[PDB]
Amino acid sequence: GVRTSPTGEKVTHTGQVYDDEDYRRVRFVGRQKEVNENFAIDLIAEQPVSQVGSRVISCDGGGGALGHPRVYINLDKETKTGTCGYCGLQFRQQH
Amino acid sequence: TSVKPIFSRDMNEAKRRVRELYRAWYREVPNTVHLFQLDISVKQGRDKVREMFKKNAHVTDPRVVDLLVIKGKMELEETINVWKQRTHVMRFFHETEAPRPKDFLSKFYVGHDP
Amino acid sequence: SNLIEVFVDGQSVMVEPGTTVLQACEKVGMQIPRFCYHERLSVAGNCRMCLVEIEKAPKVVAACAMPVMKGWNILTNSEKTKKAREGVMEFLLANHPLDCPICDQGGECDLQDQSMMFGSDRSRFLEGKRAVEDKNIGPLVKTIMTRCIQCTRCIRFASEIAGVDDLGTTGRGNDMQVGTYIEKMFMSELSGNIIDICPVGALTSKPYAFTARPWETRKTESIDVMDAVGSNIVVSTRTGEVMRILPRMHEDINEEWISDKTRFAYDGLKRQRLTEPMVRNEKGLLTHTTWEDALSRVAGMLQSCQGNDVAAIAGGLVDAEALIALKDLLNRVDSDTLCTEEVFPTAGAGTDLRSNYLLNTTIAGVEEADVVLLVGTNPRFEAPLFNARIRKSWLHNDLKVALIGSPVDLTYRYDHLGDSPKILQDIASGSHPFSQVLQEAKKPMVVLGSSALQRNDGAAILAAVSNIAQKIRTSSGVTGDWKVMNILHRIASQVAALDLGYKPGVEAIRKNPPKMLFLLGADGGCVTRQDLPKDCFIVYQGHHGDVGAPIADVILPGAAYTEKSATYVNTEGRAQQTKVAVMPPGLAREDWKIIRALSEIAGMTLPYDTLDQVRNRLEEVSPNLVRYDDVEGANYFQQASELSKLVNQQLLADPLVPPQLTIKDFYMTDSISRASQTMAKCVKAVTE
Amino acid sequence: TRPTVRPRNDVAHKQLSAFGEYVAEILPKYVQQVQVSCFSELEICIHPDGVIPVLTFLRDHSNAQFKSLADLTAVDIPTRQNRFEIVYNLLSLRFNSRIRVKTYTDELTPVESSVSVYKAANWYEREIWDMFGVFFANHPDLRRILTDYGFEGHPFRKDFPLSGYVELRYDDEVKRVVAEPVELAQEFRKFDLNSPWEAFPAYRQPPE
Amino acid sequence: LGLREIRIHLCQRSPGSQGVRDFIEKRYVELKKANPDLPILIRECSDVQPKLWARYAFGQEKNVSLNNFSADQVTRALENVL
Amino acid sequence: PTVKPPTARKFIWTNHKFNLSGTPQQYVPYSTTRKKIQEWVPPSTPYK
Amino acid sequence: TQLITVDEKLDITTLTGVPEEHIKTRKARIFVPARNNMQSGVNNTKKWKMEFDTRERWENPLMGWASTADPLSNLVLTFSTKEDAIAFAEKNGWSYDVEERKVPKPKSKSYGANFSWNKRTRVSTK
Ligand code: SF4
Ligand code: SF4
Ligand code: FES
Ligand SMILES: [Zn+2]
C-alpha cells in the first residue's frame, strides 16, 4: 500500500521524498530506507461506517479505559457523516 | 555608601600587587614549559602572558583589581603545582582556529554577525 | 471631590462614581474571574463567574455590571464566594466535551486555568453531555460549536464593532445554538479578530489549526506592516522559524485588534521567497551565483556609471535603515533620481513642511472630534482599525461622518455628498446645509485618503482641503490648539521615505530617463523595460519577487519585515521599530548591510559599521526617528496654505473612486498577500 | 481540613516566636528580622558584619546549643542592591530545632570567614567562592571545587546561561582535547509556563 | 557645485529655538518662493539642539548651530550658508 | 502461548526480523517532513 | 571598618568571564511581557523581563532540528522595577534598550447606558 518515487525508492505516508540534487540520498546508500508499509489513510475506508439508530451517539474506541475517552458526537448532518476526531471513523443515523 | 575594600586603599597598592603578580608569572613560565613538556617557545608564552595583562588595562576600581589579583594568584598556584594538566595550559592558547576575521566583507560572506 | 470609598478587604480606595465593582478590584490588584466580561465590549452578565459576597446581604450579587454605592466592603475571599465559584465552575464543565488533547487552545484556554485556580477537584453528572453539530462559517475560521459555552461574546463583538449582524442565539434551555441560521459564509473585515474573542476553543484559525500548541513557541516583539496604523504584533515563533502572530496592545492606536490581512499574511511570507543572488545568462536566462560575482558586476557597472543616470525606486516594505544607506550611497556617487512607489504630489512644498504628509491629529485623538468629513477613501478597506476607531466614536458619543468620493459599504451611515471635485469646490464656497454644520460645530476633522491622490487632481484637491482647514481653523475659535485636517496613507515605508525628504513618485524618471536603477520592492506598474532604455540594469532587491523578478537583471534576496531590526513610521509620525524574530532563509542578508557591502566592493566607502551607528546617522538626518513610541504633531498651517497658492491647477469634472472598494481588491494588491494561498482561498470563497 | 492537610503545631510556633524575640532583643546590634514560617522553622535576617559574633553566640550561651552547622548557599537574586544571600543552617543537638541564619551580602564586600568558629564551613566557603564569587576574608585556602580548573565564569549565577560557553572535543591535528565555543545539537526549548490568574491570594504584594 | 538639502532641527523651549520660530513665522514664504528647487525642511521632535545642516557637494554635511540666536542673526547665518 | 496465541489485529508481521545491526539491512534516521520554505523558481521564458 | 570607599560605577564585565563578542555585540531588551491575548489575565504582567535578541537557528540536517551557536539566546531575567533593571544592565556591561509600561486605561462602562433611549448606544441583541 505504498507508492514509489521516480528516483526508484519508497516514499513515506508523507510526501517527503528527495530531489536529484540532494545528498541524504547518498547517505541512504548501502542501508535500507525503512518505511512502515501499512499506512493509516487507507485503513479508514476499509471500515464499515456504522449506521446507529439514534440521534446523538457515543464513542470510546474498543474498551473502557483502553483507548480514547468518551466523545459524544452529533449526527444531524442529513447527508454528511459525523467524524470522531479520536477514532477517525464515521457514523450515520437511521430512525 | 560605605564599602569595605578587599586589599587596597587607592590604586597604588593595586598597581603594586599586580606588578608583583606579573613578576611571579614572568619567573614561573620556563618551569612550566620544562615540566608539562609543552610545544611552544618561551617568547610566545611570555607574549601571550603580557597580552592577557594588557587586555584588562583600563579598570580603575581597586576592588576589581584586587579580585583579579586573587584570580591570577589562584591560577599561578594551580599551575606551579602539577594539578592543571597539559590540556588546560594548551587551552590558554588559541591554535584551534576559529580564524573568524574582523572585516566587514568576510563577515558579510559568512553572515548574521554585524 | 466625586470619589466613593470601597473597602476592598478592609483596604479603602477611592473610585469614580458609576463604575463597576470589577474595575475597583482591578484597581487594587484583584482579578475576580470572568468569562462574559471584556474590557472593550458592552457588559453582559451571562457567565455568572464574577460573583462576590458583599456584606450585610444574604444574596451574592454580580460584579461585572454592578454600580457602586457609597462606602462598600467587598469580600473576595469569603466562604460562600468560593462555594459559588466552585458551583458555577462545576456547572460549566458538564456539557463541554473531552477535547483538551485535540483542542487548539491547550496552553491558552480559560476553562482550564480558572478550573484549576477556582474550581472543584471531583466531577458529577454521569449521564447527559449534549452535542451541537458544527457549521461552516468561513475558510478563514475553523468552527466547532460543541465547545461553545454560549458566553455571548462573539455576538457582542460582531454587533458592536464589526457592525455586520450575522451572529445570534437560537433556542431555549440547553439548546441554544450560537451561530448563523442561513448557511451563509460569514465574510467581512475583522473576522480574523473573532478567534481571539472566543475564550474557549470553539472558534479557531483554519490554516493554523493543528500546527503547534502555545507553550512551545516563544513570543517576540514586532510591528504591523502593509497597514498605515501599525498595531503591535507578537510573533509566536518556533523551530528557528515562525508559528503565528497575535495582536498586542497599544493604548492609543489599534487597541486590542488587528487586520485580517496581517493576521493571515505569513503564509505568503514563507511561500515563494528568494534565497539566491541571481544573474542573467547567455541564453537569456536567470541563474544564481555567489555574492562575489553579483556584487562585483553591480560594483563594476556602478563605477562605470555616473551623471543623472542612476535611479532608485524604493516601494513596498523597506526600512529607515535601507533608505538612509541608499541616500548616503547615492549622494556619495554623484546625485540621484530616487523615487517611491505611490506618486505623492509636491506643488505647495509637500516634501518638507511636516503638516501635509502625515496624520496631523492622533488616531486616539479622533474621539474628541465631533464632525468628520471624509474625502475619497474607503476606511473599511484602507487601514480597517482606523474605521473601527471611527465606529467606536460613533457608538460611544455623537458624530457626523460625511463621505465625498464613492458609494461604498461603510457600516455606520456615512452621509454621501457626491463624487466629483465640483462638490469639493462647492463646499469650499459653502453652498450646502452642511457647511453650516462644519463652521458652526465645535471640533472639526477632515480626513483625506491618499488613494484619491494618485490621479491628476492631486495638488488642487490638497490645496482646497487645506483652504477648508484654514477657513475653519481661523474661524469659529477651535480650540486652541487642535486640528481639523489630516491625511492618511496605505504603506508605512512611503511615510518613512517622505519623512527622509525624498522625491515622491516616478515623475523624476519620466522627466529624466536613467540608465541604471535600483528596485527596492517595485510592486506594481511603476516602470517597464519598454518605458526604459534597452541596457536596463535593474538591481531588484527584495523577497518573493513576482513582479520585477520577471523583469530581472540582477536579483538580490533582501529580508522580510519579521527578519530584521528595522525602523518604521506609522501614518501619524510615530516611529516604531521591528525586532529580530526569524533569521531569513537562504543567504538573504539584511538590506542596509547589503548596501554597505556594495559600497565597500565599489571603489568608495560608507562611514559606519554597526546598526547603532546607522541609528546615529538616522538621528542625524531626522530627529524623531529614534525617539521610540512618541508623537508630536506639526504646525504652521497658515504657512502651508499660503504656500499652496503658487501653482494654480484645475479641478477635473470626472468622478473619482478608490480602487480599494471590495473584498478581492482588499486581498490581492500587495506582495505578501499575493504570494499566499489563504488569500486565494478566501478570494474564491467570496467571489463564489 | 482534617484529612489530606498537614496540621501545624502552635505550641512550637509560640516557643520559636518567644525564642526569636528573645534573641532579637538581646542582640540589637545586628538584627533586622526574625521571621517564623507556618511550619515553624526559624529565620534570622542579619547585616553582614556580625557573622562571627552571632555564630560564637549561637554555638554556646547554654540557652541554645546549636553545635551543628549545615549549608551556606547564597542564592542569587537580582533586583536587589545587595544581591546574594548567605544561608547558614544551624541545628541543636540537645533541643531538636533548626534556625536559618540568613545574612545578606553583595557581589564584592566579603563576609567574615566562618571557618574560624565552625570547622565544617571550609569546603563550603571554598565551593561558594568557586560557584558565585562571594569572597571570604582571612581564609586559609581558596581554590576551585566542583568546576574545571581552566574554566571560569562562576556558573551558578543567573547571568551564566544553562549551556556553558565551552565545548570540548578531541582532535588529531594537535593530538589532544580542545575547547571550542558552544554548538548545540538541539535548541533546549525554554517553554513559557507562567500561567496567569493568581493562584495564591494571600501573597498579593502591594503594588505601586 | 550648489546645494541639495537644507535641514532645520528644533525644540520648544530655547531662546534660539524661539528665534528660529520667529524666522519661520516671518521669513520662510519668501525664501521658499525664492528657491523652488531646494527642499529646505523643518523638524521638531521633543527636545534637541536647534541645528542647521546643509547636505551638498557629493556628501558634505556642513553643520552650523542656531542655538541662542536672534531672528536677524538666523537670517544672516542662513544667507551666509546659502 | 499454546493457550492464547493470537490477537485480532491485521498488521503483525509474518517474519519477525530480529536485531539486524552490523548488516547491509538496518535503520538510518532522516527528516519525516516535507519542504520547509519553498525556494523560488526562475522563469525559463527569456527576455532580450 | 568604614574605610576609604569611593562611590562610583561598576565594571563587572571583566569578572563575569564571558568573552568580548557576547559582551559587546548582543543588545539586551528590557520589556514588560505583553498580555497573551487569547487569554485575558495580567498576572503574567507586573515584572520586567530582560531578554536578548534572537540569532541564527539553522536546520541540523540529520534529524530536522534547530541547533544554534547561541548560549545567551535562552535567558530571561525577571525584575521588579525598571530602575534596578537599568542599574543591573549598566552594572554588567552590555548595551541595552528600555521600553516603557502600558496599562489598560480605565473606562466607564455601564449596563444602563447600554440600554439607552435617544443615544446610538444600543446592544440590538439582548
Ligand atoms: S476550550 Fe479546549 S482546552 Fe479549554 S476546556 Fe474546552 S476542550 Fe479543553
Ligand atoms: S462561539 Fe465562543 S465567543 Fe461565541 S458564545 Fe460561543 S464560547 Fe462565546
Ligand atoms: S462577568 Fe460574566 S456575569 Fe459578571
Ligand atoms: Zn472516538
DSSP codes, A4-73: --TTSS---SS-----SS-SHHHHSSSS-----SS-SSHHHHTS--EEESSSEEEE--SSTTSSS--EEE
Residue C129 near residue C156 (C-beta atoms within 8 A): no
List subunits contacting chain B, requiring 3 or more Cβ pairs under 8 Å.
Answer: C, D, G
Cell (9 digits) for D122: 571550609
CA distance C84 to C73: 19
In DSSP terms, which residues pair with A52 in a beta bridge?
Answer: A93
Compute chain D's Rg from CA coordinates. Answer: 22
DSSP element (H, E) containing E71 = helix E71-81
Whether F11 contacts chain A with CB within 8 A: yes
Chain E residues with CB-CB distance to C623 below 8 A: 9, 43, 45, 48
Helix (H, G, I), strand (E, B) or coil at C405: coil
CA distance E48 to E42: 13
Residue C351 near residue E42 (C-beta atoms within 8 A): no
Residue type, C104: D
Domain total in chain A = 1
List subunits contacting chain C, requiring 3 or more Cβ pairs under 8 Å.
Answer: A, B, D, E, F, G
Whether D169 contacts chain B with CB within 8 A: no
Cα angle C497-C502-C506, degrees, rounded to a multiple of 5: 95
DSSP codes, D42-87: EEEEE-TT-HHHHHHHHHSSSS----EEE-------SSSSS--EEE
- Residue C415 phi/psi, 5-degree rounding, is -95, 105
* Grid cell 505611490 in the structure block, residue: C342
Question: How many residue contacts between A and C have a Cβ separation below 8 Å?
Answer: 24
Protein residue with its CA nearest to atom 6 in ligand 2: C148
For the sheet containing C444-448, what is the strand order?
Answer: C415-416, C400-404, C371-375, C444-448, C485-487
CA of C201 to the centre of ligand 2 (A): 9
Closest chain C residue to B105, measured at CA: C597
> Which of C150, C159, C180 for a ligand 2 pocket mutation test, highest count of atoms within 8 Å of Cβ?
C150
DSSP element (H, E) containing C171 = strand C168-172
Residue C55 near residue C73 (C-beta atoms within 8 A): yes
- H helix intervals, chain G: 20-24, 82-92, 111-114
Cell (9 digits) for E44: 521638531
Tell me how far CA of residue C535 lies from CA of C320, C548, D132, F48, in angstroms: 30, 16, 67, 10
Atom of ligand 2 nearest to the CA of C197: 3
Residue G17: is it exposed, middle or buried by C-beta count within 10 angstroms (0-12/13-18/19+)? middle
C108 DSSP assignment: S
Alpha-carbon C83 to chain mean position: 44
Chain D residues with CB-CB distance to G11 below 8 A: none
Closest chain D residue to C240, measured at CA: D187
CA of C110 to the centre of ligand 3 (A): 14
- Angle at which helix E71-81 crosses helix E15-26, to 10 degrees, equals 70
Residue type, B94: H
Domain total in chain B = 1
Domain ranges of chain C: 1-212, 213-270+667-688, 271-342+491-632, 343-490+633-666
Half-sphere exposure of A82 (CA within 13 A, CB side): 26
CA distance G89 to C650: 60
**Interchain contact, B109 vs C291, CB within 8 Å:** yes
Q: Which positions ≥6 away from E30 have C-beta within 8 Å?
A: none
φ/ψ bin of C115: left (φ > 0), alpha (ψ from -120 to 50), beta (otherwise): alpha
The DSSP bridge pattern shows strands G48-52 and G28-31 to be antiparallel
- Residue C320 phi/psi, 5-degree rounding, is -70, -35
Residue C535: is it exposed, middle or buried by C-beta count within 10 angstroms (0-12/13-18/19+)? exposed
Residue C584 near residue C560 (C-beta atoms within 8 A): yes
Q: Does domain E1-82 have CATH number 3.40.50.40?
A: no
Residue C599 near residue C606 (C-beta atoms within 8 A): yes
Chain B residues with CB-CB distance to D164 below 8 A: none
CA distance C644 to C654: 23
Q: Which positions ≥6 away from A48 have C-beta within 8 Å?
A: none
**Interchain contact, G84 vs D190, CB within 8 Å:** no
CA of C88 to the centre of ligand 4 (A): 29
Q: Of G51, E39, E45, E38, which Cα lies nearest the Cα of C569?
A: E45
Residue type, G7: D
The torsion angle over the Cα atoms of residues C558, C560, C564 and C568, rounded to 10 degrees, is 110
**Interchain contact, G108 vs C232, CB within 8 Å:** no
Closest chain C residue to B103, measured at CA: C609
Range of the domain at G92: 4-126
Cell (9 digits) for C476: 469659529
Chain A residues with CB-CB distance to C133 below 8 A: 74-77, 82
For the sheet containing D31-36, what is the strand order?
Answer: D31-36, D42-46, D98-104, D85-91, D68-70
Range of the domain at A92: 1-95
CA distance F31 to C496: 43
In angstroms, the first-to-last Cα distance of chain G is: 75
Q: Of C672, C687, C667, which Cα lies nearest the Cα of C260?
A: C667
DSSP element (H, E) containing D31 = strand D31-36
Q: Which member of G5, G7, G25 has the closest CB to residue B5?
A: G5
Tell me how far CA of residue A2 lies from CA of D132, F31, F33, in angstroms: 59, 18, 17
The DSSP bridge pattern shows strands C141-143 and A50-52 to be unpaired
Closest chain C residue to E46, measured at CA: C632
Backbone interruptions in chain F following residues (C to N > 2.5 Å) = none
Whether C97 contacts chain A with CB within 8 A: yes
C563 DSSP assignment: G
Domain total in chain G = 1
CA distance A22 to G122: 64
Q: Of F23, C586, G58, F30, which Cα lies nearest the Cα of A26?
A: F30
The torsion angle over the Cα atoms of residues E17, E19, E21 and E24, rounded to 10 degrees, is -130
Residue C392: is it exposed, middle or buried by C-beta count within 10 angstroms (0-12/13-18/19+)? middle
Q: Which residues of C185-195 are buried (b: 16+ CB within 10 A; e: fewer)?
A: ebbbbbbbbbb
The DSSP bridge pattern shows strands D176-181 and D166-171 to be antiparallel
- Residue E47 phi/psi, 5-degree rounding, is -165, 120
The DSSP bridge pattern shows strands C516-520 and C538-542 to be parallel
CA distance C382 to C376: 11
Residue type, D76: D
CA distance E72 to E19: 8
SS3 string, C13-62, reads EEECCCCEHHHHHHHHCCCCCCCCCCCCCCCCCCCCCCCEEECCCCCCEC
Half-sphere exposure of C197 (CA within 13 A, CB side): 24
Q: Of C92, C89, C36, which Cα lies nearest the Cα of C64?
A: C36
Cell (9 digits) for D24: 532579637
DSSP codes, C282-348: TTTEEEE--HHHHHHHHHHHHHH--SS-EEEEE-SS--HHHHHHHHHHHHHHS--EEEESS----SS
Q: Which positions ≥6 away from E76 have C-beta within 8 Å?
A: none
* Residues making up chain D, counted from first to last: 208
The DSSP bridge pattern shows strands E41-44 and E51-56 to be unpaired
What technique solved it?
cryo-EM
- Residue C136 phi/psi, 5-degree rounding, is -130, 90
Q: Which positions ≥6 away from B114 have C-beta within 8 Å?
A: B107, C590, C593, C609, C610, C611, G25
> Which of C30, C31, C41, C46 for a ligand 3 pocket mutation test, highest count of atoms within 8 Å of Cβ?
C46
Cα angle G35-G36-G37, degrees, rounded to a multiple of 5: 95
Residue C124 near residue C248 (C-beta atoms within 8 A): no
Chain D residues with CB-CB distance to G66 below 8 A: 186-187
CA distance C87 to D175: 72
Q: Of C223, C323, C220, which Cα lies nearest the Cα of C577?
A: C223
CA distance C195 to C188: 14
Q: Which positions ≥6 away from E67 have C-beta within 8 Å?
A: E14, E16, E17, E49, E50
Range of the domain at B81: 1-114
DSSP element (H, E) containing D98 = strand D98-104
Residue C417 near residue C434 (C-beta atoms within 8 A): yes
